């Protein structure tokens, strides 16, 4: 075997030329796409809002043109993928985990139109899903597209190509080109054997697709939080402790999850028919709430900012907390087009808030800041439910900034994932990857 | 809230010799901080944290402790270490400082040269007689001043107050000052002032008559 | 360097008011808690309380309701305390702090020079300035002690030099002690008999509490 290593230890690195450049151009489709996909789920919610005037005295019928706005583009998007592409339902970073495990194809020519107009719809009506959820399965796709119209052969070309895709993904959603790379290494590399997926075009991909958010997309951050204060060492534990109710809860959101899943399937039987309507149902909801209680819909970034402030009640703060859990479920579990992540940095800034806020009360000797135990919530959740720590960690740093807070945002990430683990959960990509390769033999 | 209760409130030892201050906690404290106070300016952080330094804060002082009871100590005391020092916790909320304890220089003693006053011709002329008695540059502090008018004892009407700890020289210094109307002043004719210190058995008088 | 300046103590009739000020230079003033200590006539440090940069935390001793009121403007970089129904107990020299941590213990870190509040119903008043010339029949030795007497002044503080402070090396001002709603103290001035009468010493005061400033030239008696 040594001799054998001594040669390899001397080609490591030498991704080929053919492959650099198609993650090149990889990266820089699925930029535009997200960019793409972002404006378009602005512009329909704007014009929803627009509506809301047009009809600013019948507070009956006003909360009518809101539950019927949104239920129709619902639907729409829950039509667009029971009819051409039911693996684009839900966030589908699990369908491109097992691409990458070749148990699943990716049927770009169907999910690319559907994915992008189906979540519009489901996004741009306010059900509480996320950006990224469609920009990383449409990344990949994209990824799959470049390599059959080039036909490019070979498996590295294949698994790269479609990793570099759904890097770029993440990426172009969040502004966190390392939270990018990190993902795939992390958590979407099949898991269980090597692989070749040269990191470098990765690398490669993430950089183009991150230039072209930012040429649409400067001036603003996602989530604008200020400089807080610092950790002191004394302070620490109570982060642990934050950790380790993360970590208890992790695992139990997990189980909402996959047996809303079975409840809300009860619900239609797998009825084409039944199941949009019921989407338009929630789409609604959604839509309803959106002017009613704008903090227990849509995708959740507007809150973070307020909450680590400090400038909400601990009364709103658990009202937002199960009201939010229980629209997450709903949008989610249904089986709408749209991804889980973005809103569960919302419900895990707010539960964080909520701890500092306490934690305030009772050691005005530690000079406490509400608001840093917010942002160390904010990827706990990715950590004890995901399990994919060192993402959260990361993505959590490159969208709030404030790398002072390093110490905290770990300590409360490994008591999550800790904790998850000990308590009896499973990484939930991996736990419904499982359940639809279950089905998917289980019908032999 | 927590009690500091600093040891030797007041304390002497002489320069290169090793002093150790206490600081004595109600219930339990953790990683408390020292100020270092002289006379007409703003206390200085010496040591926190149970035991580190300030930068500045030069190596012959130290502290130590845990739980309850806390110290800190100087291996060679210099003359600029005369200050007070205070000890403060903020462990528990909300923040407590001790007493403090002032240390001062320890010299040899040394005798008070007496000086004695008639009340100025400007204060008679408004009507008030002050006899004023400076008993400067001694060691130790304690001392006794009696006056005496006609030679005969009298206590009512006097006044004293004592220096700090002098920087040059460490000595001491007290005045007396005995008011009279100018009336009564003129009723008599030799006033005395009589200084007992340690550094004699028989005190030192100074006086002046009229006439 | 880092400085703390502390103003707006001085004298305050019973059950009034007052507001002192801190202004802060040589270094950032907001990302630092700041915080008030006072010490009472002879006695300990005893907190006040302390207002956090975003003045959305500010804890006070344990004391009544509008007690104190400590706040911040960040803007102009002074930190503010108002105190209100004064009494004697809040006679004291003020403190203005900034606050810091290193195990996560906090600390005074650098303080103020302060700022005195006297709280009274006694009425301003200028000093009389009389010389201590010794007597008549002075035994007159190599050195001379001369002093002079500053007498029935109020509020505190006198301040006290010897031919506009030349004259450093053998003074002593004592501490100046009170008696029917007054002040008194004396300074003494030991030279050489080489001195004086020879040239002429002088003690200069000044009250500035009564805009007093006045010098008194110490001559021989008889
Ligand atoms: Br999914």
Redesign the pocket.
Known sequence: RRRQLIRQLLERDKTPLAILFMAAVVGTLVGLAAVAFDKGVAWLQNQRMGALVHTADNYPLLLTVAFLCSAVLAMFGYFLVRKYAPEA???????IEGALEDQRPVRWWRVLPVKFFGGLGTLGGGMVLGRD?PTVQIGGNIGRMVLDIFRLKGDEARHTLLATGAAAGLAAAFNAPLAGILFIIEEMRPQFRYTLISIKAVFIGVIMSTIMYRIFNHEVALIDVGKLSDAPLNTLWLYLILGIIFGIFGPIFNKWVLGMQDLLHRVHGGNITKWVLMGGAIGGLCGLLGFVAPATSGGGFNLIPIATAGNFSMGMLVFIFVARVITTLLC?SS?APGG?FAPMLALGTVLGTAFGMVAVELFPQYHLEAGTFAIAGMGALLAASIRAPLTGIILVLEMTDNYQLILPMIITGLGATLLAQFTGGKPL?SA?LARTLAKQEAEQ | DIVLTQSPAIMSAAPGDKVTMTCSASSSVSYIHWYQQKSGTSPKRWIYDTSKLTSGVPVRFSGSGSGTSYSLTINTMEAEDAATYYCQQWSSHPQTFGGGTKLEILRADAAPTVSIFPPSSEQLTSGGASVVCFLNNFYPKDINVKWKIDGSERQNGVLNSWTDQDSKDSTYSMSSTLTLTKDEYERHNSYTCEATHKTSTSPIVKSFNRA | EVRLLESGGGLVQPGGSLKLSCAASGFDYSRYWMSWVRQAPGKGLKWIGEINPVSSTINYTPSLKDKFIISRDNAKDTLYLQISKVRSEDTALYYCARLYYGYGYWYFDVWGAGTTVTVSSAKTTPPSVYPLAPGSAAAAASMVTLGCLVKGYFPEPVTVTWNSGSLAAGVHTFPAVLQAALYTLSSSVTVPSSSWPSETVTCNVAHPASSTKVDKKIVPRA
């Open positions: 339902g839900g966030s589908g970073i699990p369908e959820g989610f089986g889980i990509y419904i």
